[PDB]
Structure 1
Amino acid sequence: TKGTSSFGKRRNKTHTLCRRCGSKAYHLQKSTCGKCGYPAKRKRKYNWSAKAKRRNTTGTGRMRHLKIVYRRFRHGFREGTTPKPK
């Protein structure tokens, strides 16, 4: 009865998609995420999981501002200039 019988009672979910990390780990009762600790300011990460870091690091996403900073860097972040016109 502890098995197949009590596997039907599973109907109300514990977690939902966190809004900061898009993972399905937001405990609806504790109101905090198990993947990023959303209500806490600091993203939670431990060294004892070397791989969960490599799944969430500065390369894993779009770097929509870093991949351009790495390009404006090769010229000391020049500003207010354009090439000489034709």
Structure 2
Amino acid sequence: TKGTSSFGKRHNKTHTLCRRCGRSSYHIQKSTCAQCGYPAAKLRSYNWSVKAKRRKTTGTGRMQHLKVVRRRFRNGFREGTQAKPKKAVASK
């Protein structure tokens, strides 16, 4: 009778929330992500899956550290301080 009835016995979550990507695609039984190769060094970023890379790429996230690296390059990675050529006394 396994027609809609085949849908009716579907209660057992095969995939749970990815530790790497939250895309809910990690196989309990194989302990491995479809897509994002779950704790086996490589993320499985396929060049056949052009769209997959597009999701996984830089720019989908805030790119926090690396954005600051770009501006510092133009500064020629200087540690110091520019400060102030003229007065400028803070008194009340």
TM value normalised by structure 1: 0.89
- Rg (Cα) greater in structure: 2
* Local SS of the residue matching 2:64: coil
> Structure 2, unaligned stretches of length 5 or more?
none
User: Alpha carbon RMSD of aligned pairs, Å?
Assistant: 1.3
Distance 2:5 2:26 in 1: 28
Distance 2:50 2:78 in 1: 38
Deviations 1:18-44 (A, max 9, x none): 111111011011111112111210111
> Structure 1, unaligned stretches of length 5 or more?
none
* Local SS of the residue matching 2:73: helix
Give the residue type in structure 2 aligned to 1:27: H
Aligned match of 2:5: 5
Runs of 4+ in 1 over 3 A off after TM superposition: none
TM value normalised by structure 2: 0.84
Aligned match of 2:83: 84
Distance 1:37 1:27 in 2: 10
**How many residues are paired up?**
85
Distance 1:55 1:15 in 2: 20
CA contact (8 A) 1:26 1:32 kept: yes
Cα displacement (A) at 1:2: 2.5
Give the residue type in structure 1 aligned to 2:24: K
